Design an enzyme around this catalytic site. Sequence first.
Site, PDB file in Angstrom:
ATOM      1  N   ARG A  27       0.777  -1.247   0.000  1.00 23.16           N
ATOM      2  CA  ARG A  27       0.000   0.000   0.000  1.00 23.16           C
ATOM      3  C   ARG A  27       0.813   1.303   0.000  1.00 23.16           C
ATOM      4  O   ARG A  27       0.361   2.297   0.567  1.00 23.16           O
ATOM      5  CB  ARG A  27      -1.024   0.015   1.141  1.00 23.16           C
ATOM      6  CG  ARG A  27      -1.970  -1.114   1.083  1.00 23.16           C
ATOM      7  CD  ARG A  27      -3.220  -0.913   1.968  1.00 23.16           C
ATOM      8  NE  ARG A  27      -3.445  -2.073   2.825  1.00 23.16           N
ATOM      9  CZ  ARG A  27      -4.614  -2.420   3.360  1.00 23.16           C
ATOM     10  NH1 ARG A  27      -5.709  -1.689   3.169  1.00 23.16           N
ATOM     11  NH2 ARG A  27      -4.677  -3.502   4.112  1.00 23.16           N
ATOM     12  N   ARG A  31      -3.933   5.765   1.367  1.00 24.04           N
ATOM     13  CA  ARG A  31      -4.593   6.953   1.914  1.00 24.04           C
ATOM     14  C   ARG A  31      -3.705   7.783   2.832  1.00 24.04           C
ATOM     15  O   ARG A  31      -4.053   8.923   3.107  1.00 24.04           O
ATOM     16  CB  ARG A  31      -5.837   6.551   2.700  1.00 24.04           C
ATOM     17  CG  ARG A  31      -6.985   6.019   1.831  1.00 24.04           C
ATOM     18  CD  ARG A  31      -8.375   6.027   2.531  1.00 24.04           C
ATOM     19  NE  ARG A  31      -8.865   7.392   2.787  1.00 24.04           N
ATOM     20  CZ  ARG A  31      -9.376   8.227   1.860  1.00 24.04           C
ATOM     21  NH1 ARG A  31      -9.506   7.873   0.579  1.00 24.04           N
ATOM     22  NH2 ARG A  31      -9.766   9.436   2.230  1.00 24.04           N
ATOM     23  N   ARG A  40      -8.193  10.224  -5.575  1.00 21.27           N
ATOM     24  CA  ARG A  40      -9.296   9.248  -5.411  1.00 21.27           C
ATOM     25  C   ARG A  40     -10.680   9.872  -5.563  1.00 21.27           C
ATOM     26  O   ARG A  40     -11.566   9.322  -6.244  1.00 21.27           O
ATOM     27  CB  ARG A  40      -9.247   8.595  -4.042  1.00 21.27           C
ATOM     28  CG  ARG A  40      -9.861   7.242  -4.063  1.00 21.27           C
ATOM     29  CD  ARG A  40      -8.917   6.242  -4.621  1.00 21.27           C
ATOM     30  NE  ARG A  40      -9.586   5.114  -5.258  1.00 21.27           N
ATOM     31  CZ  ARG A  40      -9.028   4.392  -6.215  1.00 21.27           C
ATOM     32  NH1 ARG A  40      -7.820   4.722  -6.654  1.00 21.27           N
ATOM     33  NH2 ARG A  40      -9.662   3.367  -6.768  1.00 21.27           N
ATOM     34  N   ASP A  76      -7.303  -3.221  -7.041  1.00 19.39           N
ATOM     35  CA  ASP A  76      -7.748  -3.912  -5.831  1.00 19.39           C
ATOM     36  C   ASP A  76      -7.899  -5.352  -6.182  1.00 19.39           C
ATOM     37  O   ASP A  76      -8.058  -5.675  -7.359  1.00 19.39           O
ATOM     38  CB  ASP A  76      -9.067  -3.354  -5.362  1.00 19.39           C
ATOM     39  CG  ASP A  76      -9.526  -2.229  -6.215  1.00 19.39           C
ATOM     40  OD1 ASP A  76      -8.687  -1.358  -6.537  1.00 19.39           O
ATOM     41  OD2 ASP A  76     -10.696  -2.115  -6.614  1.00 19.39           O
ATOM     42  N   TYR A 154     -13.993 -13.197   0.400  1.00 24.31           N
ATOM     43  CA  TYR A 154     -14.695 -11.975   0.092  1.00 24.31           C
ATOM     44  C   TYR A 154     -16.006 -12.227  -0.631  1.00 24.31           C
ATOM     45  O   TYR A 154     -16.938 -11.444  -0.463  1.00 24.31           O
ATOM     46  CB  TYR A 154     -13.804 -11.061  -0.725  1.00 24.31           C
ATOM     47  CG  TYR A 154     -12.744 -10.384   0.110  1.00 24.31           C
ATOM     48  CD1 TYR A 154     -11.415 -10.755   0.033  1.00 24.31           C
ATOM     49  CD2 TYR A 154     -13.086  -9.345   0.973  1.00 24.31           C
ATOM     50  CE1 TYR A 154     -10.435 -10.107   0.810  1.00 24.31           C
ATOM     51  CE2 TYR A 154     -12.134  -8.691   1.738  1.00 24.31           C
ATOM     52  CZ  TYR A 154     -10.814  -9.084   1.655  1.00 24.31           C
ATOM     53  OH  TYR A 154      -9.888  -8.440   2.437  1.00 24.31           O
TER      54      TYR A 154
END
Lengths: 356, 356
Positions: A27, A31, A40, A76, A154
Amino acid sequence: FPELKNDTFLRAAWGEETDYTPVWCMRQAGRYLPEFRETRAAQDFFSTCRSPEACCELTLQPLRRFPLDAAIIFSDILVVPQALGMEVTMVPGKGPSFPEPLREEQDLERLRDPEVVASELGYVFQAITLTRQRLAGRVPLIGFAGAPWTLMTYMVERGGSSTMAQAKRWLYQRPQASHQLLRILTDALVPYLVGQVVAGAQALQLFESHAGHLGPQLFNKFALPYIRDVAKQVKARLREAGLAPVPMIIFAKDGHFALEELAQAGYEVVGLDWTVAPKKARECVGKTVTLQGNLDPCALYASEEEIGQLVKQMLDDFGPHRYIANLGHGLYPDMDPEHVGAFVDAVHKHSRLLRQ
Amino acid sequence: FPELKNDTFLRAAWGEETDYTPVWCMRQAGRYLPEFRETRAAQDFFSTCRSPEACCELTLQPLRRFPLDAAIIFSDILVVPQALGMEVTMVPGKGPSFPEPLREEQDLERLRDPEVVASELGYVFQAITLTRQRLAGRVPLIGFAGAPWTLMTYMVERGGSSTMAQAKRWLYQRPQASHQLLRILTDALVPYLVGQVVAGAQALQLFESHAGHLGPQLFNKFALPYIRDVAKQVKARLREAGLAPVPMIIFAKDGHFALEELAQAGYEVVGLDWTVAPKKARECVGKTVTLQGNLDPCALYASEEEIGQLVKQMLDDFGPHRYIANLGHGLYPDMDPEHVGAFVDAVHKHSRLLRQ
């Protein structure tokens, strides 16, 4: 594509000696960067993903701050189940999720043929080509995907639980259907990953982020075979297409119990979480494979001076050979960029010392 | 109190040979029992906790269904931080939590002196005495508490996260305050646990449920010292009070990295999660301590026949000596009681075979 200038990461990945220890951060595009949040909001998470230029831009952002020794394409892992036909919603603050998870065996009928998935993920290939061209050979570009088991978690849960009790209920109560879903995922992943390499990825990481929910027995039945199959089939297809195979990295988060097996799964690099002591990881894996990791990402909350010392010790434990520095998991969104820079500088500084 | 009739659990716990392998289940008193939910709604979680009769009743419920070889008093680990003065709210479906977590060092000023905590937890002692009297010596009664680090995670986060990034941020950014909070928790736990034994507990389990969030380095600094201190001080106080010390169990969930250390922390029993292979656990701990565990609780979603086979293999791996069967974590609320019964029967049946 332009000639690669710094290939330290690739040489380490293949096991070769290098002048310093290469480093990157899971990552790194995340963020914790203000410029990341800015960019974003200019679409809506997946409209960001679907813009090659936007994905290329987020991929390069960290490399403008830090002398990282690789870039990883921004996407992702859920793009795969989405391309199989699951609908995704971006929950504002609470993250991409499936409002209609697979609930029973019959729900497998809604999935596309895995053979069509690669055509659905063309945007990602375009981002990869663009980022490879714009990087202009500065450092290598890593492609990636989620591992079959983890993607399964998921699809069945809705997204992230704390027990994966529902996913594990599938394994125990619906073993035949589970294996079916896992094969579909495998058969979709292989062409996606080959495609990333055709588009210009110079290495690949498989993220088995939810490995730890399984013990050895379930993992060897339901996670490992598919992990092995992904590597074998990707390598084969690349060979057959006339292309050079790329170093492949398997990262099983909370997978201490599987390291021995993972070191013989057909991957050049086994990535480690921060709960494994580097010396014991080296014991488990042996001396062929490269290790990647493994600093506690929360360590970056410490002072720059403390980060330097924690890095010094981590490097002493791993030794100079067969090692790529990284964190033990992805950066958290509240982290301080300058502390990421300290981490990177510390790896480079101390690894040079350790050598002469 | 009445003379204990079945002491198999205590003998195993101390390391002695036994005619069969004793078994109990973490959360044996839990929502998977319909009679549990029924009785819970008759107050409001903590008004249940605060009723000795209600806590005694929930404790006995499993023993009416299954020939378990121990009972564990029903309470919650958060009774300690509550008794220190943190307010708790029962979130309906979403569980006991702190609406005002500790946010900074100054917030420690709201906590009571740990020396007064035991007087605040008198209801629990009363439940323990009552349950010991009502059990009438059928099997031993286990008392328990959360471990200092884990209780800290609940106080600082609000309750359960997935990263304990905020708790771990304390460790890295506020090490002095962290140690202060951990000492307060330790100093509160010791008299609470001594009190449980005075009230009639015949063994004690410390739950370090959130161990896995730490790697070795942080764990040895912030979790382990306090784990050791709890055992040393409880044993001392009991001795000094003229009482027999009780077997103590340390359970560090996701604590594979710490097993060697935990086996020399002053605990008769090290409890194991389901991610550790029994043979490797035995390697790590050595042959003095007793092991407890470790079946994947989700295994109970399998058929009764499959549960029997998984249990057979688990028992073959652990061997007959120094072993108490349990799950690797607490039962989940959707589990089938008859599958719990299969687990219990299977431990008893196969352990007898394994012996002659």
